[PDB]
Write a protein that binds this ligand. Structure first.
Ligand code: NKA
Lengths: 99, 99
């Protein structure tokens, strides 16, 4: 799809058997999702944003289907206010900015 | 330009007579710039992000030239870690996401 930016660029994702909405976020290096149940091993990580830092769990080689396109990569899980799809996964679905 | 997302989507901006770099950020509703000298009246505002909230100064009808495209709108100035161009200005330069 082409997506204009008059509204938040939200898409449906399927991850860990669950359906969620997430923001396509070109300002995010990495993918950060709200607390959710994910299977397997993880590693503690601190990440920074506009108002300071949060502690997240780092999960590698996680499958995510983003608006019907499959990607596999790192997902960070923690107290983010919104689910964010970052460039680590946007590059896999072929996402570009155009003006 | 078409911009792929293997690197941060940074562009040159000119605002308040100054040259700066800023991130084209589809996950940002509003435009937030690092402390800088802007002329005229402003209004206190608190905005929230990944790690909590920051106090910004709200400036309206500010001219910004974003990668050679002119836009006029609200700019928030405050302790953001990075200069962010949000959807309020991305819609004016015709920016879209495509996959
Ligand atoms: C969380 C997200 C929903 C909104 N944020 C835009 C994201 O793109 C921000 C932009 C950004 C902020 C700080 C920073 F150091 C680097 C980049 N990205 C973000 O938090 O990403 C984090 C995390 C993602 O992976 C890595 O890449 C950058 C770091 C790092 C951890 S925001 O907090 O910066 C933001 C920006 C503009 C806004 N305008 C508003 N307006 C409200 C009044 C609605 O809220 C805003 C909130």
């Amino acid at each position: 799809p082409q997506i204009t930016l008059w509204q938040r660029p939200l898409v449906t994702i399927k991850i860990g058997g669950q359906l969620k909405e997430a923001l396509l976020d070109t300002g995010a290096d990495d993918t950060v999702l709200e607390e959710m149940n994910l299977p397997g091993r993880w590693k503690p990580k601190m990440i920074g944003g506009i108002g300071g830092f949060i502690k997240v769990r780092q999960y590698d080689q996680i499958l995510i289907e983003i608006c019907g396109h499959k990607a596999i990569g790192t997902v960070l899980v923690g107290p983010t206010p919104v689910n964010i799809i970052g460039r680590n996964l946007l590059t896999q679905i072929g996402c570009t900015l155009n003006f």
